[PDB]
Amino acid sequence: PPPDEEEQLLAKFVFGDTTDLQENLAKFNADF
């Protein structure tokens, strides 16, 4: 059984994850 989204939103919050945050850093260079 795979994890859903709204429980995985609870995952990155409760486990103290920054992997969602760290990927948003390397995604952008000159978005303007």
Added chain:
Amino acid sequence: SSLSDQLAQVASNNATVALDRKRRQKLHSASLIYNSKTAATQDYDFIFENASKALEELSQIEPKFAIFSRTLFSESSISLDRNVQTKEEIKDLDNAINAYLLLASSKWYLAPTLHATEWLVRRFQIHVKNTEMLLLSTLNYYQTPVFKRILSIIKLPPLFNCLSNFVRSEKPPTALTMIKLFNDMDFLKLYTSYLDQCIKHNATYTNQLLFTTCCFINVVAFNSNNDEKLNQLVPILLEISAKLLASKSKDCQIAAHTILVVFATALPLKKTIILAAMETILSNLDAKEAKHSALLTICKLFQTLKGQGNVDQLPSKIFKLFDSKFDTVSILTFLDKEDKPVCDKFITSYTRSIARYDRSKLNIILSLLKKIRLERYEVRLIITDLIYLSEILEDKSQLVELFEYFISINEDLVLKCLKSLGLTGXXXXXX
């Protein structure tokens, strides 16, 4: 070297690493808004409330700050310390904050940017790690009280050693000491690489872009003696003004005119460089208010140089481009201005190019000469071309009326050029 030299080199690399409590109470205590006692007693959680509440106001002023709340000003970005992360991840934290201080630098008089950057000061340690792009973004506010606070935190880099006497000083850093910064040949090479980075994002604002040139004029001014110093200076300044003309913005283009005209009067540039500069001024010249400033460059640029080929005909790609952006009627309304600038050495190169390339409109070539009192050698150098044109062109009555203007004034000048080339009776026989 010695021991204490190498062992103070470790101190710079761990300038942010909080090790003892007293080390933390010195690093965390410094900030932009709160004084040294009330700053040390508050969480990052407290600071993030005031920042994210303020940053949503800046997103209302312009929507560009909305992206940083996803990455830097997000709630998950409290746990991340710089020191824990790898070397590739830190450069992305720099390239976010370097992208941040561009957008931040414009709205810097406003109160919400002071509460916004402070969390990016105190959590992300930009007053130690990257204080070049912190200071280069905010280098134009030297009179303001907000830059006096910015000095009261930063350990100054080795390139900003001129301001090092103004750190935690009473009075603001004065206007000449800002010039002693820009007088260095290395500090300019930042402020190029800051500006060409700042143009690519197309966020260059009016008060900033004045203070660039108002320093870049003075650097040419303080070095107007040392001809060696100027010779090594224009790979720095003219490569800006080349890239500063490539801007879509009309406001950036007028700044390139201020640096070009000032440097051209201070150093006689070559003919090929001035014709190079005159194309790039012509090529990206779109708006109204950029055109008026652009015409007073070529008015002034052609008078700076003087030598053989001073009054040469313009090249083909140059001239029709100049006819494309500047009209032959609009150049006449320009000469009728009661400012009446010295348009003297350019138009005698403009008129000769008409005589060779276009030739359809020589009604104008009379009316050009009534409006400007020319120089002595220029009129001779014009009339030689028209007499060459008199033989070659399929003979025309309006060309006869041009010489009637020179039968009116300087009759012997018409004779002496005919006595140099050709016959006296043969020209009047030709018409």
